Amino acid sequence: RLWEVITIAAVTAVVSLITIVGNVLVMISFKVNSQLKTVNNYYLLSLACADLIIGIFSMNLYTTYILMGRWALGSLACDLWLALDYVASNASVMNLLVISFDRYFSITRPLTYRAKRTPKRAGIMIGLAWLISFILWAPAILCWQYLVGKRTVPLDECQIQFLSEPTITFGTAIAAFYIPVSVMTILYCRIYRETEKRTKDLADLQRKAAQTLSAILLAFIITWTPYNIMVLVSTFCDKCVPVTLWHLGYWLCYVNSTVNPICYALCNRTFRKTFKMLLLC
Amino acid sequence: AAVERSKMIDRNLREDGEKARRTLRLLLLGADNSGKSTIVKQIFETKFQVDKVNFHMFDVGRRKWIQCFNDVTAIIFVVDSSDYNRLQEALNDFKSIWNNRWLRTISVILFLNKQDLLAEKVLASKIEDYFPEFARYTTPEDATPEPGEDPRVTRAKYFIRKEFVDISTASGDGRHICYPHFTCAVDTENARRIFNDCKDIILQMNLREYNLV
Amino acid sequence: SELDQLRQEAEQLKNQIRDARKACADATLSQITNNIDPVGRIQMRTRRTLRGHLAKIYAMHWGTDSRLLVSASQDGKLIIWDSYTTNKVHAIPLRSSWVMTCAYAPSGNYVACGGLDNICSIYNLKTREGNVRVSRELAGHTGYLSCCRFLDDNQIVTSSGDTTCALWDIETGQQTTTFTGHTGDVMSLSLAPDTRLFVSGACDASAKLWDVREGMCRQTFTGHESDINAICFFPNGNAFATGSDDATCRLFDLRADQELMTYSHDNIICGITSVSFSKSGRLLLAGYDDFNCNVWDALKADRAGVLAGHDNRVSCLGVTDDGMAVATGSWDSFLKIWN
Amino acid sequence: TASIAQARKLVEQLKMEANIDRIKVSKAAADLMAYCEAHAKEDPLLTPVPASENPFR
Ligand SMILES: C[N+](C)(C)CC#CCOC1=NOCC1
């Protein structure tokens, strides 16, 4: 049993190190390259900041919680860690939604949008994403025990208290995952239609969109689906969801934050060149 | 004190750079008597606006100042399709522009001008004498003549386009794309054709931005 | 008849020039400078980076001192920098954004500007209005302006794209003396330190020495195999170096009237944009198209160092009057000052 | 008579090029070699100055 938890700790440390160095490289590649200081890469810096908050704080504390079998750090630290984790995860998903909207507007309207891709619109979209995430999760997590009046979460474990209440659970899942994945799927399908359409129109005047565009959506969906399925099944069937399957879903959500740079930042050649510069030193 | 003057200049520099990046710069090229000045009905600079998007066309009244237009959106190349003696010279002029060191990421908006004189010439003067490849050439089955035109006109028009797109498909390999067309003497839709082609150029830049095409 | 006889006489006169140059050759520069020790590895690094432009930067020129440098880009801005503090003294706007050249007066009171607009624009800096005003415009060239240099803050020699060079007068706006000897368009010009002789490099693989008072071509140098778009004098003034698109730098001597040394490297294929010498002239710095600019030993033809600090094509290069620093501007929005 | 006068001036320019003092290369190369050696102490690029005397950092 010691080899199993050593293997789990090693795998979680490797993936936390990978996402930390990836988001640090995306910040450094924006900072040291003035060609990358564009309006559209501010959204990627927002995403990178959210994923770095996830990779530094959330993964390691989660793993230690799984490995020790208990929180053992106080109820206040549990509530603050849960609030920070959920706010950062939702900020990451909101950033993905905002990036998808930016790509959709710059693809379907490539000339009209260029005059509306100002730094003030990018800043207000990033601020709206982070504010929506904070309003959606932080008062719900930190103040549910005062609204109910009792703390039903046991002291040894760390878990959101409203995950038992069906309404708030479905509401905070359809406002955090189902509507964003639906809008992202619709926008990326419309993007695929626009690419096929331009190729046909050009041939009427005179693929790579199958791998990248379908690997972004599947890397989001595979890594965020089982948590959002097990929360909605656990709010009714109390003990259906196994314990190891639950922990794996929770972790997979972090895995998405690990694989986020590769799907958004690394797609841009100027980042790949800056990363090949940065790694070697 | 001098640092604040330099910071006040940088506010004025970024304000002028936003207006410069908000318009599209175009290079107008072509041979003599090809009607370059009559392409748009609205060094010499021409300004016109289509769908609240500002365009800037520049023409110079040989092969050395082409480095100054490395960052333009597109190159508007105008060919006189009426005459055939200078048509081979215009084909070689397009080949040098397409296979240029500083023009590899710059798409070319081709404008085969004077198609009404081309239609009058083929209905009367032999294109086969000036081009031996027009013999044993057939119109493709997926061809749509728009204004109910004669098949001899359509075969002649598709042959002139074909000779200008085998040059474009020989090199480049998707980095920059030639967008052919046809223009009469009194055609007023050239502003929309430039707008639709510059729509595709920025879109292809955006698809390469997101690694989609 | 008469035209064929004059062409045959010119071919015989051209054969006499080649025969006199072959008889004048007795040794090469490498044989004389074989015992001279090399300069070693050059560890020149970027001191200041000027990040105020927004387009491709095509030309720059230093002042009399090593403080103020002018810079011209494709955004229609003629920014005068303070290289000591990386400040911006002036931010002169231009009527035409297509600018291929700029100049700084020896007195420092004026700057020049030119490009595809065929107009040499002189801007007065020391004005009582507190802003830069357009002093004069010189519109006597039928080709695109490629280089311009002030002589004595009243006469400016401009090289244009209509195969002509002209000596101007600022106060009158007229061409004082026109130099018509080139068959290709002229892309480079430099002034000798005594401000009486100058050699212009054109695209016909020929550099012709001119006189600002005689108005006659003193010497013709045909050693290059491609078009020439870079030229600079030796600090001695008895020699000059050229830069072509053949990836070759050639040093020509005025008294010897032929080529001395070819600074060519077989690894280098791409062309050369701008050349300049050091204070003593032993270091020849050439701006290439492989995103970097190299430092060449002017007496040993060895690549002394690589100034790899640009991610785009370097287009201009300037060395101060006292040789304290070298500033290279490239096709990005940056000027980088070295040492 | 413009072509005749331009051809006459091109001959006179070639005559001015022929009537010049052609100093030998070995005397000419020794002048640039001695000029480089005499001014080598005053070159801040060939001889690296210390950071106190250098105004650039
Ligand atoms: C559970 N974990 C903290 C690992 C991730 C989370 C969360 C809640 O917010 C979101 N769920 O999916 C989309 C955003």
Author numbering:
A (entry chain R): 26 to 231, 438 to 512
B (entry chain A): 18 to 59, 207 to 225, 231 to 254, 265 to 303, 306 to 394
C (entry chain B): 2 to 340
D (entry chain G): 6 to 62
Q: What are the paper's exact sentences on this?
A:
Here, we present a 2.8 Å cryo-electron microscopy structure of the M5 mAChR complexed with heterotrimeric Gq protein and the agonist iperoxo, completing the active-state structural characterization of the mAChR family. Prior to cryo-EM analysis, we incubated the iperoxo-bound M5 mAChR-mGαq complex with 10 µM ML380 overnight on ice, followed by freezing and imaging using single-particle cryo-transmission electron microscopy (TEM) on a Titan Krios microscope. The resulting structure achieved a global resolution of 2.8 Å, providing sufficient EM density maps to position the receptor and mGαqβ1γ2 complex. However, due to poor density, the scFv16 component was excluded from subsequent data analysis and modelling. The iperoxo-bound M5 mAChR-mGαq complex revealed iperoxo bound to the canonical mAChR orthosteric binding site, which is characterized by several key aromatic residues. The rotamer toggle switch residue W4556.48 forms the binding site’s floor, while three tyrosine residues (Y1113.33, Y4586.51, and Y4817.39) move inward during activation to create a tyrosine lid, separating the orthosteric site from the ECV. Residue N4596.52 forms hydrogen bonds with iperoxo, while D1103.32 engages in a charge-charge interaction with iperoxo’s quaternary nitrogen. Relative to the inactive state, tiotropium bound M5 mAChR, there is an 8.1 Å outward movement of transmembrane 6 (TM6) and 4.4 Å inward movement of TM7. Comparing this M5 mAChR structure with other iperoxo-bound mAChR structures reveals remarkable similarity, with root mean squared deviation (RMSD) values of 0.49–0.77 Å. In line with our mutagenesis results, no cryo-EM density was observed for ML380 in the ECV allosteric site or in the EH4 binding pocket.
